């Protein structure tokens, strides 16, 4: 009866809704009984330590499983003909053909073929042996234990920091930029130069001999005399072979750009140079704000001074420092927005500029990594907007935000929502109309009547990069231009060789189907932003419900009065926008996967004349690439793709089980549960036992969340199964 000790209101519920909401309100510390702000922030800090320990344990487990059951030794010697092994399989449900079908990469028993790209990353950063991976796993185990001890320690009242320490923004930014960002990047440069650079050239460097091996034959003296160009003397040749000393070099900070010819990945010396420059700039950035040494910035005064005259922004940024600092939800929204955008950047960059050795030959790994980071980015961006809506519901003070840009953007929120609606409506109308017109003219036997708008602007920017394929001869595509001549002895040769080659993903050739799918992506982003922005801006109140801020961020409705108030809270707007995020990321990853499937087969045409109409999308992509997937098991037997077929049907089942909660609502189920309670309360031989908690139907918000969770899980599992099966079974 006293299980939700954080919420005595929930503990007095004599139903199963008590435990259901006890699970789901456990991390809403602000809503907990007897919660001060000091205890809030200290709990936040300790939970952060727990999360860091969890992440470190997870990567240590990856290292230990690859070192213990993987084929890292065999993969290092033959990176292009050995399947990386994730972990061994011990499932007593396997029949004998399942045991044979899962024994693949030279292992003793059934194993899972890794698609996470940890093999390429660890091989690139200089890890060569299973002993090194085990040492890394043990070190991460110890450091996660240390972080757990720190989380315990800072909850103790002798070591609990003050609330003002948590809100010390200038110091936290200074140390994060200078130390967490800068010093870490400098240390990664040190690892790359000391370990990864020699291990890329067949020279083993470890803790036993890194103090007796010289990273550059002219040690430190060029660094200290300012002759820094001596660290970029002889780069690795185009004939260089990875992990061997054949045609290597001595330079540690090259600057050639492009890709390594053998690994089809970026130069490691380029990475060391990049990380060193990033470390310098981030340490400088961390020397910006004022702490205790009489120099630096007060960010409050910077926000005060950012008020343009003539009342263009009203009061400008009056009191935004306190608005951000007092609100944990504002900070969490900013952090989630930035982190989701960075995750999208990571997805968009690692496929086109492959960083790790022998990446972009493992086609399943690239597709899986891209789709993973894109889905993570979409979820995190929805979380950013949801926490912005929470900040409007909870932490927004109109008095201290009077005249500043927040009050201005809340003042004319109808214009923002209406213009997002106009943009989404235009994009949906036009993209769907062009697609349906193309479908109809394709069906009627007239492909020449298609509307194929050439993406001339994106092709123009591609030409500005040096892509001499559309004949613009603009900036970098003309060698006579000032940017072309400026770095022609710098990054221009390698970058131009990468940009003019059709064998990589460095800015692929685009056509009308790319135009149509880019407008589809624009429609998805616009509509998801419309739902999320409308939910945030209408979170405090609307015309249908003026006092919405009093009812909280999440609540079922306001009853059937005033015409009906279903899905009126900002939580419901986030709920509706998660579907649109899933649809948008589905479009993005469908586009990426079909384009790269055309590229990897050498048949760019299949996408070029099949993406302009939707029947080509359904038939030449969804229907065609699922043939090996659905034959993972059959009456004639089974093979290694059986797990992805089972996960395919599994995700379909979870998706429709989500539809169950999505369509049916709480009222039929409550009557059914009452009828079954009547049945059990007077069934003979079962009246001996009775429920401690009264069985009730799931609440409206709870079942909306459950249906959304099943929808997302089925979506993700289905697409992951299809993508990994259709790429790994084919390549």
């Amino acid at each position: 009866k006293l299980f939700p000790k954080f919420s005595q209101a929930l503990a007095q519920d004599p139903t199963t809704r008590r435990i259901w909401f006890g699970i789901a309100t456990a991390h809403d510390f602000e809503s907990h009984d007897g919660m001060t702000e000091e205890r809030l922030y200290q709990k936040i800090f300790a939970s952060h330590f727990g999360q860091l320990a969890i992440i470190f344990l997870w990567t240590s487990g990856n290292l230990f499983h690859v070192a213990w059951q993987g084929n890292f030794e065999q993969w290092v010697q033959d990176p292009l003909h050995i399947r990386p092994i994730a972990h061994a399989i011990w499932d007593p449900h396997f029949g004998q053909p399942a045991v044979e079908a899962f024994t693949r990469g030279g292992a003793s028993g059934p194993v899972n073929i890794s698609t996470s790209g940890v093999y390429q990353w660890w091989y690139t950063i200089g890890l060569r042996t299973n002993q090194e991976l085990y040492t890394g796993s043990i070190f991460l185990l110890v450091l996660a234990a240390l972080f757990l001890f720190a989380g315990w320690l800072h909850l103790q009242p002798a070591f609990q920091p003050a609330l003002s320490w948590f809100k010390n923004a200038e110091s936290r930014l200074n140390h994060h930029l200078a130390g967490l960002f800068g010093v870490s990047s400098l240390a990664w440069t040190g690892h790359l130069v000391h370990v990864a650079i020699p291990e890329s050239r067949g020279q083993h460097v470890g803790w036993d001999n890194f103090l007796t091996v010289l990273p550059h034959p002219a040690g430190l003296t060029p660094f200290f005399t300012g002759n820094w160009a001596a660290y970029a003397e002889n780069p690795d040749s185009a004939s260089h072979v990875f992990n061997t000393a054949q045609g290597s070099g001595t330079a540690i900070l090259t600057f050639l750009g492009g890709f390594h010819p053998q690994t089809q990945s970026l130069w490691l010396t380029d990475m060391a140079h990049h990380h060193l420059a990033i470390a310098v700039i981030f340490i400088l950035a961390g020397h910006m704000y004022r702490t205790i040494f009489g120099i630096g910035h007060s960010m409050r005064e910077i926000l005060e001074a950012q008020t343009p005259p003539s009342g263009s922004l009203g009061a400008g940024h009056k009191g935004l420092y306190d608005t951000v600092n007092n609100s944990l939800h504002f900070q969490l929204g900013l952090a989630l927005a930035s982190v989701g955008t960075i995750s999208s950047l990571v997805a968009q960059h690692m496929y086109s500029l492959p960083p790790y050795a022998f990446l972009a030959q493992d086609f399943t790994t690239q597709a899986a990594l891209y789709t993973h980071h894109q889905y993570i980015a979409g979820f995190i961006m929805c979380g950013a907007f949801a926490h912005g809506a929470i900040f409007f519901v909870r932490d927004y003070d109109p008095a201290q935000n009077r005249g500043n840009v927040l009050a201005r953007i809340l003042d004319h929120k109808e214009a923002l929502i209406s213009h997002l609606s106009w943009a989404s409506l235009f994009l949906g109308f036009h993209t769907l109309g062009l697609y349906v017109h193309n479908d109809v003219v394709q069906a009627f036997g007239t492909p020449e009547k298609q509307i194929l708008i050439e993406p001339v602007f994106a092709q123009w920017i591609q030409a500005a990069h040096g892509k001499t394929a559309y004949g613009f001869d603009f900036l970098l595509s003309s060698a006579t231009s000032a940017p072309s001549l400026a770095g022609q002895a710098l990054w221009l040769p390698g970058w131009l060789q990468g940009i003019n080659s059709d064998a990589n993903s460095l800015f692929l050739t685009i056509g009308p189907g790319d135009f149509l799918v880019h407008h589809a992506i624009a429609l998805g982003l616009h509509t998801t932003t419309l739902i999320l922005v409308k939910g945030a801006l209408d979170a405090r109140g609307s015309k249908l419900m003026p006092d919405k801020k009093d009812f909280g961020y999440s609540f079922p409705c306001d009853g059937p009065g005033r015409g009906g108030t279903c899905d009126i809270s900002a939580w419901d707007a986030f709920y509706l926008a998660v579907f649109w995020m899933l649809n948008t990321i589905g479009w993005v990853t469908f586009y990426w996967h079909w384009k790269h499937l055309g590229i990897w087969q050498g048949n760019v045409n299949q996408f070029n004349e099949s993406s302009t109409y939707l029947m080509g999308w359904l038939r030449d992509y969804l229907w065609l690439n699922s043939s090996q997937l659905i034959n993972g098991y059959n009456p004639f037997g089974m093979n290694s793709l059986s797990v992805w077929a089972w996960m395919f049907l599994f995700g379909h089942l979870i998706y429709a089980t989500g539809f169950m909660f999505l369509i049916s609502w709480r009222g039929y189920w409550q009557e059914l549960i009452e009828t079954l309670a009547w049945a059990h309360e007077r069934t003979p031989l079962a009246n001996l036992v009775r429920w401690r908690d009264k069985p009730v139907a799931l609440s409206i918000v709870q079942a909306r969340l459950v249906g959304l969770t099943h929808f997302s899980v089925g979506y993700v599992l289905t697409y992951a199964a299809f993508l990994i099966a259709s790429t790994s079974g084919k390549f």
Binding site: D411, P447, E448, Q450, I453, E454, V456, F457, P512, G541
Partner: protein, 165 residues
């Protein structure tokens, strides 16, 4: 050649596509007698296909890797290379016609809003008034610009409902 595209008058794959379509229609032909109604229908379809392909080659459309016409949606890039009819001229045409329809509907709204029962006039449409305003909406751009310069096109924000933030 505006973006690596070749004109469909000289692109080989356009002629190949036209030949394939005509050959498929001839394969359809080679089953009926010469003067039957299906024969006349297929002959008309063939004539329409050849006319369409010859017109597309005549109008100066751009073909990509294969023989499919591509449209240019950049002013200047389509103006100086003679493809303003791809997007720009239909852009002007749609803007004019949509403005005509929208201005006619707007003027109907403001005409029936100042009547005895504006509620009834929107389900029971005054047909002569609608016809007159549809005719008057052909001068929509000049009327709209005049009302914008007069300030009578937009409404002051102090007379428009908003939510209580």
């Amino acid at each position: 050649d505006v973006a690596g595209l070749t004109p469909c008058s000289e692109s080989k794959a356009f002629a190949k596509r036209k030949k394939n379509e005509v050959k498929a229609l001839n394969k359809r032909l080679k089953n009926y007698e010469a003067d039957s109604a299906p024969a006349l229908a297929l002959k008309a379809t063939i004539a329409r296909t050849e006319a369409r392909f010859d017109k597309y080659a005549k109008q100066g459309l751009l073909c990509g890797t294969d023989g499919l016409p591509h449209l240019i949606a950049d002013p200047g890039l389509a103006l100086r290379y003679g493809h303003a009819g791809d997007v720009f001229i239909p852009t002007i045409g749609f803007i004019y016609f949509a403005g005509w329809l929208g201005y006619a509907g707007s003027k109907y709204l403001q005409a029936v809003a100042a009547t005895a029962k504006p509620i009834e006039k929107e389900i029971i449409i005054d047909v002569p008034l609608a016809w007159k305003l549809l005719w008057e909406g052909f001068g929509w751009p000049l009327r709209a610009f005049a009302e914008y310069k007069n300030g009578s096109l937009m409404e002051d924000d102090a007379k428009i409902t908003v939510s209580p933030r």
